[PDB]
């Protein structure tokens, strides 16, 4: 994350770390939506152009972490992956449309002060909150400054406003579909703050004033990150029926 800050302890209990088994490293961010299901971005797992096709055995998920590198014993929880479910219409050739994936854990994880599922939005919540200017939150262990070509010590958090669809459309050459939305401040505002590549797959959350709960409205698909423009997020509610289909058909 760029221009954010250290997240407070348990400030984002649903934050998940997609950890590459070997070489050992941070793969992406993700989120806990139930004791057995983790949601993330599809491009973190699948991208043929660079022949990236991680199998369940190449990864692990670490839940309840704060520190990026320390093994936080009796706090974090490491789980193995039972199965990965990339959206069937994930468009990696074109524009990461439907950049989403589901991961079923091998065994259910127990919740704690540091491990807790985030809510998925329903129609009204999506209608109420998904408006230009309203702000959502992003968290991750991604990079901090423009990739000079850096890493944070602990989980980073930052708030960003949703951008008007047209403004966003006019900001890129990419065909932004109705399954995505943008967030980020205007280039003039000098008020930066964004998610970088390491933060992709992580959650974009919003706190509902109606019930005081946190909802994941989007998944970090391509943050205008540590780049030299707005970030792109997967529209979770637009892809809600698929999510439930997977969790209903698969999973106990």
């Amino acid at each position: 994350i760029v221009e954010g800050s250290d997240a407070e302890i348990g400030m984002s209990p649903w934050q998940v770390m997609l950890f590459r088994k070997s070489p050992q490293e941070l793969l992406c961010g993700a989120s806990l939506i139930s004791d057995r299901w983790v949601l993330t971005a599809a491009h973190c797992l699948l991208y043929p152009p660079w022949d990236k096709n991680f199998t369940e055995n190449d990864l692990l998920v670490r839940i309840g972490k704060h520190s990026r590198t320390r093994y936080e014993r009796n706090i974090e929880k490491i789980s193995m992956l039972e199965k990965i479910y990339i959206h069937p219409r994930y468009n990696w050739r074109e524009n990461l449309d439907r950049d989403i994936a589901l991961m079923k854990l091998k065994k259910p994880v127990a919740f704690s002060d540091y491990i807790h599922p985030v809510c998925l939005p329903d129609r009204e919540t999506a209608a109420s909150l998904l408006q230009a200017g309203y702000k959502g939150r992003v968290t991750g262990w991604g990079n901090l400054k423009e990739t000079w070509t850096g890493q944070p010590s602990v989980l980073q958090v930052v708030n960003l406003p949703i951008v008007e669809r047209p403004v966003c459309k006019d900001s890129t050459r990419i065909r932004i579909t109705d399954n995505m939305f943008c967030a980020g401040y205007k280039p003039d505002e000098g008020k930066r703050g964004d998610a970088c590549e390491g933060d992709s797959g992580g959650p974009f959350v919003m706190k509902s004033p109606f019930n005081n709960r946190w909802y994941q409205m989007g998944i970090v698909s391509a943050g205008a990150g540590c780049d030299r423009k707005y970030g792109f997020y997967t529209h979770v509610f637009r892809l809600k029926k698929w999510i439930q289909k997977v969790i209903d058909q698969f999973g106990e």
Partner: peptide
């Protein structure tokens, strides 16, 4: 480099 503290069980 950039080492992550060993872990698991």
């Amino acid at each position: 480099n950039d080492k992550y503290e060993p872990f698991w069980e």
